[PDB]
Design a protein around this ligand. Sequence first.
Ligand code: 2U9
Ligand code: 2U9
Lengths: 791, 158, 217, 235
Amino acid sequence: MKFSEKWLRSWANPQVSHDELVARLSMVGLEVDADLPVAGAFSGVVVGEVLSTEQHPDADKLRVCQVSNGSETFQVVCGAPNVRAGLKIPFAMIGAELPDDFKIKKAKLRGVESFGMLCSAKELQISEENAGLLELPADAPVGQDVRTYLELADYTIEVGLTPNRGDCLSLAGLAREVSAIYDVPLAPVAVDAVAAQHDETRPVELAAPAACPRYLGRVIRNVDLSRPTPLWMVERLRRSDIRSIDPVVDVTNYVMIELGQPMHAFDLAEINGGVRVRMAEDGEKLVLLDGQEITLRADTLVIADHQRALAIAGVMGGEHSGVSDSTRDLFLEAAFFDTIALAGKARSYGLHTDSSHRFERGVDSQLARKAMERATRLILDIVGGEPGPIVEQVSEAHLPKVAPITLRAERVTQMLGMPLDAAEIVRLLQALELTVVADGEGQWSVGVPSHRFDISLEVDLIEELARLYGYNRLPVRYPQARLAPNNKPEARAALPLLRRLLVARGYQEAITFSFIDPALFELFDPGTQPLTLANPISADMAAMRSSLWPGLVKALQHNLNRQQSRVRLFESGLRFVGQLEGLKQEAMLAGAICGKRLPEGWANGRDGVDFFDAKADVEAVLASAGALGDFSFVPGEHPALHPGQTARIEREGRLVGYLGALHPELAKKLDLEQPVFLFELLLAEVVDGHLPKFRELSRFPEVRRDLALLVDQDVPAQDILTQIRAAAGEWLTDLRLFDVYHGKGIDPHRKSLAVGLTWQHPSRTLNDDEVNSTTQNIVTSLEERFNATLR
Amino acid sequence: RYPQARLAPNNKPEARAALPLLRRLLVARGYQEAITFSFIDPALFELFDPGTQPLTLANPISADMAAMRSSLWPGLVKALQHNLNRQQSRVRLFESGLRFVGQLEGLKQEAMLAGAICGKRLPEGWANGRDGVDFFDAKADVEAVLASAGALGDFSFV
Amino acid sequence: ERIEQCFSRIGYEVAEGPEVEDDYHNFEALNIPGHHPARAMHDTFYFNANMLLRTHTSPVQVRTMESQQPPIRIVCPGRVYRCDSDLTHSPMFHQVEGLLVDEGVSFADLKGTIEEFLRAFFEKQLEVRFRPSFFPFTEPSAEVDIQCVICSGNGWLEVMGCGMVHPNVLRMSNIDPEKFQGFAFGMGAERLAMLRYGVNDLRLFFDNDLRFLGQFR
Amino acid sequence: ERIDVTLPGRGQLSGGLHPVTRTLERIEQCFSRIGYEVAEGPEVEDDYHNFEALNIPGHHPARAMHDTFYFNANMLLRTHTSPVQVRTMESQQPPIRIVCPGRVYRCDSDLTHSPMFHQVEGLLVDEGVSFADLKGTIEEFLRAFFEKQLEVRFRPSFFPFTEPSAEVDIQCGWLEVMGCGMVHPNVLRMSNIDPEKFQGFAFGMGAERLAMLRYGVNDLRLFFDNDLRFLGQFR
Ligand SMILES: Cc1ccc(OCc2nc(C(=O)N[C@H]3CCS(=O)(=O)C3)cs2)cc1
Ligand SMILES: Cc1ccc(OCc2nc(C(=O)N[C@H]3CCS(=O)(=O)C3)cs2)cc1
């Protein structure tokens, strides 16, 4: 909402400077978005009158004019194509200071003496109209300072209104606030009833009184629509960001911006048998004044005649019913439309107007009549004509009525953290035009004025009090709490814990978009239909991810293309699996690595990362809550991964996730030349651990035995290690695979597994006989289960 | 009943490396946390702190628990060799605690973070090199700690 | 992490919810009527008529109010989504929302909480300004400003919003507004991170360039 | 054809923390989450902070060389973390909400008792604090700590620094796990806190005792040997 401060101050003057007013406005809940001067600075410019013009005898593009300042006649040489006798213009006398340090001096232009200059709006920084001289009203006061006359000592304040302050969508609304804020007299425009000159009316029917409980209509005969909108109105509208279009629209707009009442004028000749305020028929067609052809719905209120719809009630007029050049007679409209009935209606047709906005936000239900009289007077002043009587059709039953609210002083003290005096409370609420009647000790019955649509509860009253008292003047307290000692279980691996572990283990944390390209989704999840957005921002951001991998891989190659060799990234976030019916939204921890195993350094080996580097990272995470043993890495397969280098991770047979090298074919497709290692873990299956259960420490020495085992190249190492543990007896304290050999010294389809077996008895020393005995049973077990051999 | 409190949101500065943070970093970096007695043998104290008179107890529990430590090193080294003698090859320990420096008049009781390592650089494993730990392995551990609050550049190893 | 710590140290529980939400939890339960412009496809990402990507973490606070009776002290950090994006705004971002529902909560309590949170967060005894604003879920409501002591490039800045929980919001989730009062607050994580770290361009947050990321080690 | 098996991963894996450290962290967290500040002090303390300020008279048996480690006539190794709570009471005026974990020392040791150990002490000093407040605090702490809705018993006991005082038992037919009490008027008075305006409660517990209960540790001597075979069990 934009406005001229001068015009506001003509209703309620705060008696403080501009800066003070703009500051306070935001502090009371009307945030100022801009405060700008209406024009540039200048002095010595008065209203001048061109008495005569003559053709300059030595330059055809120039004229020799006689101009009066109401005190004296000066010869001014002018080259503007519009300079003519009778014209009221800004006369810059000798000595006048114009913008950008332009001082008017004496001149002898092509042998002719000039005692001043006549100006354009551009020259004065009034408008950008340099086409010619700023033509002032025929009735301008000759000699008066142009800044005084054109009200140039002014600013335009723009307020970013909140949806609850629809009442502030006018100068009337804004001036009421200022009067409340500053406890100053409010002087509203006195609107005298315009007396009917004739008896011509048009009947008005309220076919939908619940959607329009009040409608006012007036016949204005023999209007001259060729006449121009006066400057004061153009300036007031302009200073509110309303561009002048035609005299009749300008006044209905002016009345709206001045008082808050949106109004509409029809060409009386386009009204067949009077007005019918009714709902549209399903598929009723109406062409708007902007040319748009709307196909209406039964839920939409229209202003119609006895033949057809004329306008979409409170939003926009029709082309046919509206004023044209041929218009000689008017039918003025000022009505109240219910906010609930109008909510979202303009939007549903892809429309938004100053009228639709004010009606949706709320228009004072009692205002139509003052607005009607005001617009009548302005129409007669601007375009003439003869007014008939006002036809008021009202439905008392459907008029908005808010029940009085009881405000308790204790409730204000409680909420504000301090008591307010009864006199202060009454003063403040009455300033906002609320009706405050005492209802015993520290209680009142308060009534809501017709312009306010946000007040129905006791808390809304407290809000108003806090707002005008000053939010920053209110006390500061910290909330009381009966708090008890508490904690989460000890044996759990939380995500903040895991993140820091990954950090320590050389990972950088990435955050990628949850919605990816469906084509990317298809690469990592082939037969799966993603959960696809109905209104995606772009089509390459349409699919909800079922893996953090496409996004991580994409961030990895983003870096690779940016001169990065070693990219170690991790992300945590939701996975979206299935369609709405059955959708699983699971938190995942995923990681992606590439490049050298170690950073470049004098002390570091130049080996590239592999599977087993990523494996250690997963192991470290999986052991974070002392439950590593609960997990198993089984040879598995995943479409995004290399089938020869993929591990399916399980806990009690349930799937934890996957670990593996990104599939070489996927890499080809993505133009990725480096091997990439991925892992993804379902956080729900990682968080639980086990509390340490102490096992007694032996006072006796441990015994170690090393075994070199020849096995088929394809038999899994963990299958052998599991068999060894099962056959080692009760005293085995440690089992270590310290080497794997797949060389020339043995068969090309076999491998040697060098294992270290440690035993410790808790109550004595172990003898060589029993240990050799246990060792042979391990071997025997591996001979029968894997056809193993000692090297 | 549970006591009522007018509590206000609060926090410590963001850019700081707290001891619980550092402990977890050293855990991730392959260290085991030890807790050793603050009072050591005067002879051990002398080995690590030549020329200084320890702050000695008047009624020590034993004579080999008479000296207040001026370093967590004698205690850490002792826990390290305790393990070495108990069939351990790779011992990676850290401790945090007070050091006692000076006599009663002027005594400084400063919190220290100390670490001690020995054995193979890496644990025994099929994929791991059999190199023994050295200076530069411990250096990386100190570097990682010193960089924990984005101030690594503030430190110099001379 | 930092925002959570300011409250978890004082009894606030960290609450999480789903990112794919329903119109009841995301709008209706928060006093946002069916005809409200926030619900439109110009601002909200939809799957169908009823299912969407959450516009805030407020639904988490709703799910908490349904699950338990007061006292409630929660902080709700999370990924949130908005349709109307380009520069200055991303389709995905992070925010932390707060809720405290007890027997005798005031606007003074709210001011104290917010002012001390900001002081704690920015590690300065900075000036805090409360400006009246509007939200369907809160009444009274405020936009919170702080001085430019944390720059606009390393005299006030809007950093967050708050308000007293609306009676209808409580009522809808079976909390009696006569017995229980409450306050809520909201803030954008990226905005805060930008203020804290001197980050100029919001788009650096989702590119994941190592040259950006590495600076926060 | 570049297939591989699922052998162990390469390199270094995590170590772990000491069981006492885990226990202290856990105890602190139960209180820090509800406004308690972690307070630390020196281990080499004076007579005043360690005894006198705590209503322990000069002739009291706790002061003797049979229980307390001394450097000279007034300087000692602290027998508790209570001096830290004293230093806090001197430094500030109420409200005070602190937890004081730390190394403490006792002369009379062998088995069942070590010359050095760890304990966490608590202190809350405000305007209207009661014994009901103390019971609530302790009962909820223990349930939080042992992750069970266990039965809590308060038995009347004695301490020079508290009145009334209690020994706190939990089931498993009961086990004594900690002590507490309402701060003695003389203790507050001595540290310029008016006992007419301010009330307070304090509590004390041994970390090793708690760790032993939690982890099933039989012998208290395992805590200071630092055997890797012991330590490794708390990864
Ligand atoms: C049940 C319930 C009740 C109230 C709630 O209020 C959450 C709130 N949010 C704000 C707010 O200003 N939010 C925006 C600030 C910047 S941002 O990141 O765009 C989010 C104010 S009060 C939530 C849930
Ligand atoms: C100023 C001040 C006032 C009062 C204080 O009371 C500390 C307390 N301690 C206990 C207690 O039972 N302690 C022992 C339990 C097991 S243990 O490890 O032997 C220590 C009870 S109340 C402390 C400081």
